[PDB]
Amino acid sequence: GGTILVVTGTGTGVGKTVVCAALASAARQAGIDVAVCKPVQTGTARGDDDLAEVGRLAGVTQLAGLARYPQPMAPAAAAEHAGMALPARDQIVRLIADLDRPGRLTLVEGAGGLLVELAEPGVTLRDVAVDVAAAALVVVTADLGTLNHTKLTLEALAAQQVSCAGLVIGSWPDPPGLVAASNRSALARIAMVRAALPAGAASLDAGDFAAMSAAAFDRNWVAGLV
Amino acid sequence: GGTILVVTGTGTGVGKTVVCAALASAARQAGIDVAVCKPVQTGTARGDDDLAEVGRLAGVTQLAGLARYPQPMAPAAAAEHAGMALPARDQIVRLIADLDRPGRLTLVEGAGGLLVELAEPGVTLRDVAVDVAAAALVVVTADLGTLNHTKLTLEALAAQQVSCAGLVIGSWPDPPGLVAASNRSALARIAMVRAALPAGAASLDAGDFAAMSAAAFDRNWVAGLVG
Numbered sequence: 054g055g056t057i058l059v060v061t062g063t064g065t066g067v068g069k070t071v072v073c074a075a076l077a078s079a080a081r082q083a084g085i086d087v088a089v090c091k092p093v094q095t096g097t098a099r100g101d102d103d104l105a106e107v108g109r110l111a112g113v114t115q116l117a118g119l120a121r122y123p124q125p126m127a128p129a130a131a132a133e134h135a136g137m138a139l140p141a142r143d144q145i146v147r148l149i150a151d152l153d154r155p156g157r158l159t160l161v162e163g164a165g166g167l168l169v170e171l172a173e174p175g176v177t178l179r180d181v182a183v184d185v186a187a188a189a190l191v192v193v194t195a196d197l198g199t200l201n202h203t204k205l206t207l208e209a210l211a212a213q214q215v216s217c218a219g220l221v222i223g224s225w226p227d228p229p230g231l232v233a234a235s236n237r238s239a240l241a242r243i244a245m246v247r248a249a250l251p252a253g254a255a256s257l258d259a260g261d262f263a264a265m266s267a268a269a270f271d272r273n274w275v276a277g278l279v
Numbered sequence: 280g281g282t283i284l285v286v287t288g289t290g291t292g293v294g295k296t297v298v299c300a301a302l303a304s305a306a307r308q309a310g311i312d313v314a315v316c317k318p319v320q321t322g323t324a325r326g327d328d329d330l331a332e333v334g335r336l337a338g339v340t341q342l343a344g345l346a347r348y349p350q351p352m353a354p355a356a357a358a359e360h361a362g363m364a365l366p367a368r369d370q371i372v373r374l375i376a377d378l379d380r381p382g383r384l385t386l387v388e389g390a391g392g393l394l395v396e397l398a399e400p401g402v403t404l405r406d407v408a409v410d411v412a413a414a415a416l417v418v419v420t421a422d423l424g425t426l427n428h429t430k431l432t433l434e435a436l437a438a439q440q441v442s443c444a445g446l447v448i449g450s451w452p453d454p455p456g457l458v459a460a461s462n463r464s465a466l467a468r469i470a471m472v473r474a475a476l477p478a479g480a481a482s483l484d485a486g487d488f489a490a491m492s493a494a495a496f497d498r499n500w501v502a503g504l505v506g
């Protein structure tokens with residue numbers, strides 16, 4: 054196959070989607086073919102659509118999903134509200150495995166943090182990563198609490214031998230400030246910080262997003278992903 | 280020895296300090312001798328003092344500190360900013376073991392979440408709980424993200440064989456509302472919810488704090504903590 058990375062996070066709304074876009078954009082600019090899978094999208098009544106964000110910010114066209122729940126809740130509660138079950142583990146795993154091919158960077162986004170339920174019954178993004186042998190990129194904050202959440206997420210990955218490909222600070226404040234500066238230095242002590250996306254990047258137009266994306270990651274690390 | 284519980288949380292500001300004071304108050308009203316312990320305190324320059332609050336809300340007088348730092352930062356960064364070192368792991372252990380006593384409940388509040396560095400080098404409250412054979416009471420929010428953080432914390436506890444004495448919801452709103460209510464239902468499927476402390480417990484007076492405390496926990500669970 055090619056390279057598969059789940060893009061998880063220490064929590065909800067930490068920047069997972071804008072980080073998928075940013076890495077997709079840098080990979081494409083490096084001449085790598087990119088696909089992005091978001092198996093379960095919720096909050097569609099208010100128009101949440103993470104694949105649309107990736108398609109618009111980074112230009113990706115191979116964008117796969119399996120389910121769309123209208124309520125703005127976590128996948129299991131939204132599915133409980135709708136009275137319609139989440140997809141099954143095999144559905145999600147085979148979708149990603151069908152996307153993966155040599156020369157392709159395939160990114161997978163779940164919902165919220167690493168352990169929220171993505172498929173019936175109780176299967177997580179960590180389970181999916183195991184079944185498709187993906188490594189994990191962990192999107193973090195630089196705010197109070199991040200080191201604990203980062204360490205807890207990194208331990209949960211190592212507990213099932215899911216490799217950690219790096220950290221990304223999904224939203225880097227301007228100018229950093231005292232906590233954010235201390236938090237970035239300490240995260241850098243426990244894993245490589247691949248990038249720190251400036252705050253508000255997800256509202257850039259595609260041209261600005263691409264230039265920002267190619268400057269945010271290290272040219273060689275992106276080139277070597279596939 | 281007696282019974283030692285580390286009181287940790289899914290993060291900082293989730294209610295660890297008010298849960299200590301509530302468990303201490305309920306334990307005391309059952310006849311149980313209580314000590315409370317905070318080996319690392321940051322933010323002294325902003326007035327933060329969890330031991331002092333626990334004394335205020337609950338009337339506990341057996342309160343033991345050790346490391347104190349001016350800045351409201353994570354311990355490592357606060358001690359660094361003050362030209363000080365973190366305490367060594369044996370000093371934290373000594374603090375707790377000196378208080379342990381038969382028939383006494385000792386509560387050890389961390390700083391922030393389970394894996395925050397409390398001692399050189401990379402030593403956490405989980406390591407400390409291992410050293411004193413303590414179980415762990417996990418203070419959680421009912422807000423969004425709580426399920427994932429709670430599951431991550433419980434897994435980190437089990438990997439080191441640190442028994443989990445249950446969850447407590449640090450701040451519980453009246454009325455609940457849909458987000459909190461759903462999360463509390465989902466937390467109870469994960470582990471035992473020992474209490475849900477009403478929002479604003481920390482402002483109650485000693486009389487009302489004791490009433491709230493006695494109502495918040497099952498008395499038979501409180502009494503069963505301590506032989």
Ligand SMILES: Cc1cn([C@H]2C[C@H](O)[C@@H](COP(=O)(O)OP(=O)(O)OP(=O)(O)O)O2)c(=O)[nH]c1=O
Nearest residue numbers: 062065066067068069070071103163164165255
């Ligand atoms: C203003 C705002 C933007 N966004 C946008 C900007 C972020 O950089 C981007 C990616 O963050 P995500 O972590 O993916 O936030 P999300 O709601 O899409 O996360 P999840 O898929 O788990 O629900 O989404 C939010 O998610 N939440 C917000 O409150």
Ligand SMILES: Cc1cn([C@H]2C[C@H](O)[C@@H](COP(=O)(O)OP(=O)(O)OP(=O)(O)O)O2)c(=O)[nH]c1=O
Nearest residue numbers: 288291292293294295296297329390391449481
């Ligand atoms: C915002 C605020 C909260 N509190 C209360 C609300 C919480 O339920 C309680 C305990 O939260 P904790 O989890 O103990 O967090 P903390 O702020 O004490 O910091 P630390 O991680 O070092 O413990 O403190 C106050 O007493 N005064 C305040 O101004």
Ligand SMILES: [Mg+2]
Nearest residue numbers: 069070103162
């Ligand atoms: Mg998203």
Ligand SMILES: [Mg+2]
Nearest residue numbers: 295296329388
């Ligand atoms: Mg506290």
